[PDB]
Structure 1
Amino acid sequence: GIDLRWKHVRSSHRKAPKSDNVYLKLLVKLYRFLARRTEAPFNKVVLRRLFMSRINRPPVSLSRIARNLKNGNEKKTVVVVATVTDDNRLLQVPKMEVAALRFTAKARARIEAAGGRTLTLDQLALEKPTGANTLLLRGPKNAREAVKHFGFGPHKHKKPYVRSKGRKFERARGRRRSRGFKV
């Protein structure tokens, strides 16, 4: 006997992509080699984010990129391991160079129209193998419809499951002191 509390406990994070894209398999091979034989911490972070599922890689927009291009960051390279989406609100697009997993049709056109350049994760390793002069970005993880229903309960101010919305659907008892109580 050994009197242990835990035994044969597994890991908690993904160790390989679940997708079977052939090109993504090549991209993992490149960065798995780079992370082993390079001291730059930028490479290790990029490798793990390639394994993540779609809900853990939310899209980023052109506006969010322009927000972080101030206060002395006009000359750095933006790297986003996700999709990049055009924003209809932004009227004037600044000049930038972006390395992203993929672009929408309109986002690519407007970036190069202003005088920019669109890169690729493989070209990024060829130009900046150590990731010097770069900044990483993420999308809003919690900005999803399904997240608003999480942890429903009294005094929580969450969103209920209703087949429609109107005065005939819920409200009434338990939502106003005029009919019994309130929550």
Structure 2
Amino acid sequence: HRTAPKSDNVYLKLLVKLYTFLARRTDAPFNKVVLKALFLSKINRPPVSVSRIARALKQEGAANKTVVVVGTVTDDARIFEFPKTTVAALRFTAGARAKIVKAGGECITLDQLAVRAPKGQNTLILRGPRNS
């Protein structure tokens, strides 16, 4: 479909340049997935609730994994207990950002994510549940 972001956010195009350097110069399929996810529209980037993130952290062997969201991490007050984990994403709503910080966790940008996992070591990628 898109071979380029149809957006004109400059910082987004910067991350596209960074991850296209990675997706050329790495052999992990991770950065290719990240590049293909960066092209997605607002409909094709559905938001991810932090409740869905914690329900994802209920998976086996994932507690020392990091989570990556190409999209927006949104808050949900329907959860109380949220684990201390590391979340990297594009955008953070201030409620979800305070949930992650208040749980002792970490709000990460995708540049710092690339610095931490250039080959995508020990990661998780979550997609929002699209209906319409």
When the two structures are superposed, what TM-score results if normalisation uses the length of structure 2? Answer: 0.95
**Distance of 2:105 and 2:52 partners within structure 1:** 17
**Cross-structure match for 2:116:** 127
Deviations 1:44-83 (A, max 9, x none): 0100111111000000111111111122211100000000
Percent identity among equivalent residues?
73
Query: Which of 41, 63, 68 is 1:79 aligned to?
Result: 68
Query: Which of 105, 114, 118 is 2:107 aligned to?
Result: 118
Equivalent position SS for 2:57: coil
1:42 aligned onto 2:30: yes
**Distance of 1:131 and 1:118 partners within structure 2:** 17
**How many angstroms does 1:133 deviate by?**
0.3
More helix by share: 2
**Cross-structure match for 1:89:** 78
**Distance of 1:19 and 1:111 partners within structure 2:** 28
Equivalent position SS for 2:68: strand
More strand by share: 2
Deviations 1:131-172 (A, max 9, x none): 010011101111x3xxxxxxxxxxxxxxxxxxxxxxxxxxxx
Higher relative contact order (CA 8 A, sep 6+): 2
Equivalences for residues 124-163 of structure 1 within 5 A: 124-142=113-131, 144=132
Structure 2 counterpart of 1:15, which letter?
T
Structure 2 counterpart of 1:92, which letter?
E
**Distance of 1:133 and 1:95 partners within structure 2:** 16
**Cross-structure match for 2:9:** 21
State the 4+ residue runs in structure 1 displaced beyond 3 angstroms.
none
**Distance of 1:80 and 1:23 partners within structure 2:** 17
> If you compute each CA radius of gyration, which structure gives the higher value, 1 or 2?
1
Long gaps (5+) in structure 2 = none
Q: CA RMSD in A?
A: 0.9
Q: How many matched pairs?
A: 131
**Distance of 2:99 and 2:51 partners within structure 1:** 13
